[PDB]
Design a protein around this ligand. Structure first.
Ligand SMILES: [Zn+2]
Length: 253
DNA sequence: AGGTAGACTCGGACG
DNA sequence: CGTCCGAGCTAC
C-alpha cells in the first residue's frame, strides 16, 4: 500500500483495536521482527499492554501502546486484519497479536517483506526506522523552500530526490512519476537543474497528487506504450534511480 | 566528512 | 529454472 492507503488503514484499523489488551504475541516468521532483535523479547514485552492509538508517518504505521510503540512497514503487500482467535488464519500470516477479548490483530504478507520495530514510545522517533524521516508531504513542513534546498545540494536525479525518505516521507514510486508528469518535468533531470519555477510547480503537483489520493486516474504510471492522456504521444518507460520510470517525452522536459 | 551506490530482504510473475 | 522487481545497513 502507498501513503494514501496507509492513511486509510490507520483510520479504519484504530477503532477495531483501541482499548484492547495484548495477551499473547505469536510469531511465525521471526525475520519480520527487527527490534528487539530477538523475536521472543519482542513478543514478551508487548504482552499486557493496551492499544491506545494509531498514527502514521510516511508509510509507517505507529501503534501506540501503554509503554511501547510498534512501528510497522507493510511494503507492497503487507496487510492487517482483525478477526476471531477461533477461526483459521489466512495464508501467509506471520505475526499475530492476541487480545484478551478473543480477537486478534493479524499481519499477513505473501512477500514476507515488511518490518516491525518496538521501542519505548519516547524513543521511537529517534530510532530506526522513523529516525531521519522527512516531513509529511501534506504538511507545511514540506515546502518549496525545503525541496529547493535539498535539490541544489545533490547530484542525483529529481526522481531519486523524491524517492528519498529523508527528503519527504513515504512518497512512493507511482506518485513520483505522476507528480513529475503533472509538473512537466522529466524524471531523469538532475535535481539541481530545476529552476525556482519548476521546484514551485513540482511541490504544487506533489501535494495535489497525493492530496487528491488521500481524500479519495493515472497519466503515466504503468501506461508505457499507451497514448499520453494530454497529448497522445506514447508513454515511455525506462530505468531511473533504479526504478521502473514512466513519462511522456513531449509533456515533460 | 558525509553523500552516495550497492547489498540485502522475498516470492509471484515472466522469459 | 534463472531473472526481475522494489522500500528503506554497509562501505566506497
Ligand atoms: Zn504528453
Amino acid at each position: 500500500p502507498e501513503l494514501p492507503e496507509v492513511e486509510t488503514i490507520r483510520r479504519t484499523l484504530l477503532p477495531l483495536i483501541v482499548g484492547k489488551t495484548i495477551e499473547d504475541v505469536r510469531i511465525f516468521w521471526p525475520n519480520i521482527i527487527r527490534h528487539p532483535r530477538d523475536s521472543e523479547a519482542f513478543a514478551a514485552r508487548m504482552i499486557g499492554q493496551t492499544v491506545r492509538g494509531l498514527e502514521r508517518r510516511g508509510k509507517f504505521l505507529k501503534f501506540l501502546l501503554d509503554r511501547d510503540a510498534l512501528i510497522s512497514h507493510l511494503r507492497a503487500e503487507g496487510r492487517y486484519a482483525v478477526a476471531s482467535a477461533l477461526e483459521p488464519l489466512e495464508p501467509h500470516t506471520h505475526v499475530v497479536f492476541c487480545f484478551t477479548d478473543g480477537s486478534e490483530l493479524r499481519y499477513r504478507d505473501v512477500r514476507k517483506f515488511g518490518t516491525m520495530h518496538v521501542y519505548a514510545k519516547e524513543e521511537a522517533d529517534r530510532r530506526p526506522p522513523l529516525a531521519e524521516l522527512g516531513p509529511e508531504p501534506l504538511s507545511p513542513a514540506f515546502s518549496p523552500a525545503v525541496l529547493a534546498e535539498r535539490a541544489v545540494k545533490t547530484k542525483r536525479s529529481v526522481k531519486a530526490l523524491l524517492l528519498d525518505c529523508t527528503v519527504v516521507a513515504g512518497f512512493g514510486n507511482i506518485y513520483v512519476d505522476e507528480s513529475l508528469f503533472r509538473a512537466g518535468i522529466l524524471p531523469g533531470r538532475p535535481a539541481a537543474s530545476l529552476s525556482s519555477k519548476e521546484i514551485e510547480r513540482l511541490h504544487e503537483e506533489m501535494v495535489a497528487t497525493i492530496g487528491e489520493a488521500v481524500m479519495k486516474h493515472l497519466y503515466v504510471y504503468g501506461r508505457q506504450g499507451n497514448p499520453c492522456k494530454r497529448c497522445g504521444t506514447p508513454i515511455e518507460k525506462t530505468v531511473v534511480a533504479g526504478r521502473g520510470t514512466h513519462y511522456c517525452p513531449r509533456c515533460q522536459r
